[PDB]
Each structure stands twice: as structure tokens, then as C-alpha cells.
């Protein structure tokens, strides 16, 4: 049965390369954002949090691969940190959606009322249900690395994550709706710009999850499983790279800051 071993190895290589490139780009992007004092803003603060969540996801996945795949407490805490730093990334993508939705559909945003709330939501609701899952697992199963699934305990983390995939989709299209109205109340160029906005909003909102959100635990041997695993590994690994490229490196204001700093240094 070496075929599934080869499949898992290929998956490991592909998301290892993807997460390495993404982690490098996101580290560069977050250093750029933190360096320039002008960029300090609510949007860029939330983007810095998102970048940190992506970095933690990548490093936690690497740590889990090293500890688990190269039943003690270290292995269990590695698995717990993997799940936590996955769920935090999902909820920070949801926070991206929530903040962009609040800036537009809420008539006039109030920074002081919600920023701390958004931060604690994005870093703590994943913490809340991961802690609940850890307690339930330690009380009722407490076996192995917790790497194995034990009945329906897994959903305690997987179901809350999937909901953040649901809502953040409902946000996405709605924002893609309102821009259309913004492009309507003011042709080829109109729809081209709407398409460009949708494509650049694709990685920030993490919409590609919705394709395979509802698929249950598929059997390893099968074309659906292969396409789901390869698609999701590749897209998830390079999502941080795409976000860093779009929102830091291709951003007009950040490019202006970089060019001005370079010109003044010269």
C-alpha cells in the first residue's frame, strides 16, 4: 500500500513549498508594514494581525509535521497548537470580511467601539472552542497524540471553522454586490473593474474554501479525495503568498512608501 504513502508525501511537499514561500513573503510584508509609521491605520493593523495569523499557521503546520510525522504531552500540545493556529487564521479571514463589511454597510464606523472586540473575537473564539475540544478530549478520550479522531469530538473545532467559511462567503458576494452598485450609480470598463476587484478580494476573504466546505470525510482512495486534498493544499499554502503580494507588495501606498524611502536613501 505504498500508493497512499506516495500521495501523502506529494501533498506534504506541495504545501511545504507553498507555506515556505508564503511565510517568507508574509514576513517581508509584515516587516514592511511595521517599519513605515505612515501605514499605521486600522486597516493595516487588521492586515498585520492577518499576516501574523498566516505566519503562525505555517510555522505551526511545520512544527506538527516535525513532531508528529518525522502519545506524550508534547505531541498533543503540537496538535492543539496546529488546530488553534489554523482556526485563528480562519477567524482572522472572517475578521477581514467583518471589518470591510462594517466600513461600508455600517453608515459611519466607530474605531474605538469595535477594534478591540474584533481582535479578541479573532484571537479568542478559536481559542474558546479549541480549549473546549481539548478539555473534552482529555476527559473522554485522552489517548494517543489526539491525532486520531475520536467519534464526533473533532467537529467541536471543525464545525465552528466551517461557519466562518459560510458567513465570510455571504459577506464576500455582498461586497461584490455593493461595488457593482458603486460601479452602477457612477460598460466594458465597469465590469472589468468589478472583475478585478473580485479577483483581488478572492484571497483576502478566503472564498476558495466554499467549494469543498461541505464535503464530508472522504475515503483516501478516490478521485474526489485526491482533487480536494491537492486543490486545498495548494490554494491554502499559497493564499498567504497571494495576500502578501496583493495587499502589501502591489499596494499603491506601500509602493509609494518604498519608492520614497529608496529615493531618499539614494
Amino acid at each position: 500500500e505504498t500508493r497512499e504513502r506516495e500521495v501523502f508525501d506529494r501533498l506534504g511537499m506541495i504545501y511545504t513549498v507553498g507555506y515556505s514561500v508564503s511565510l517568507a513573503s508574509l514576513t517581508v510584508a509584515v516587516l514592511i508594514l511595521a517599519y513605515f509609521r505612515r501605514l499605521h491605520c486600522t486597516r493595516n493593523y487588521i492586515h498585520m494581525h492577518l499576516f501574523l495569523s498566516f505566519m503562525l499557521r505555517a510555522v505551526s503546520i511545520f512544527v506538527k509535521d516535525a513532531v508528529l510525522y518525522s502519545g506524550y504531552a508534547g505531541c498533543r500540545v503540537a496538535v492543539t497548537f496546529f488546530l488553534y493556529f489554523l482556526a485563528t487564521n480562519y477567524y482572522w479571514i472572517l475578521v477581514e470580511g467583518l471589518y470591510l463589511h462594517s466600513l461600508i454597510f455600517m453608515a459611519f464606523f466607530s474605531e474605538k467601539k469595535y477594534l478591540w472586540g474584533f481582535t479578541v473575537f479573532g484571537w479568542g473564539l478559536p481559542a474558546v472552542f479549541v480549549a473546549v475540544w481539548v478539555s473534552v478530549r482529555a476527559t473522554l478520550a485522552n489517548t494517543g497524540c489526539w491525532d486520531l479522531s475520536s467519534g464526533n469530538k473533532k467537529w467541536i473545532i471543525q464545525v465552528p471553522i466551517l461557519a466562518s467559511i459560510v458567513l465570510n462567503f455571504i459577506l464576500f458576494i455582498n461586497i461584490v454586490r455593493v461595488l457593482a452598485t458603486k460601479l452602477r450609480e457612477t460598460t466594458r470598463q465597469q465590469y472589468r473593474k468589478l472583475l478585478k476587484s473580485t479577483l483581488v478580494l478572492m484571497p483576502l476573504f478566503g472564498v476558495h474554501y466554499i467549494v469543498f466546505m461541505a464535503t464530508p470525510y472522504t475515503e483516501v482512495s478516490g478521485t474526489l479525495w485526491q482533487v480536494q486534498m491537492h486543490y486545498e493544499m495548494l490554494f491554502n499554502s499559497f493564499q498567504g503568498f497571494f495576500v502578501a503580494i496583493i495587499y502589501c507588495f502591489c499596494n499603491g501606498e506601500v509602493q509609494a512608501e518604498i519608492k520614497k524611502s529608496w529615493s531618499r536613501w539614494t
Binding site: 497512499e4 501523502f8 501533498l11 503546520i61 506538527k64 508528529l68 510525522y69 496538535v79 496546529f82 488546530l83 489554523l86 494517543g144 497524540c145 491525532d147 486520531l148 479522531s149 473533532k154 473545532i157 471543525q158 471553522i161 466551517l162 469543498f212 464535503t215 464530508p216 470525510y217 472522504t218 483516501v220 480536494q228 486534498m229 486545498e232 493544499m233 491554502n236
Partner: peptide
């Protein structure tokens, strides 16, 4: 389900 989690579980089972 969740990609990374389901992959880790199936790696576990196998």
C-alpha cells in the same frame, strides 16, 4: 470538511 484537519486525521488513521 476542513482540509488540513481531515488530512491530518487520515494520516493518523493510516
Amino acid at each position: 470538511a476542513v482540509a488540513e484537519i481531515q488530512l491530518m486525521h487520515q494520516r493518523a488513521k493510516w
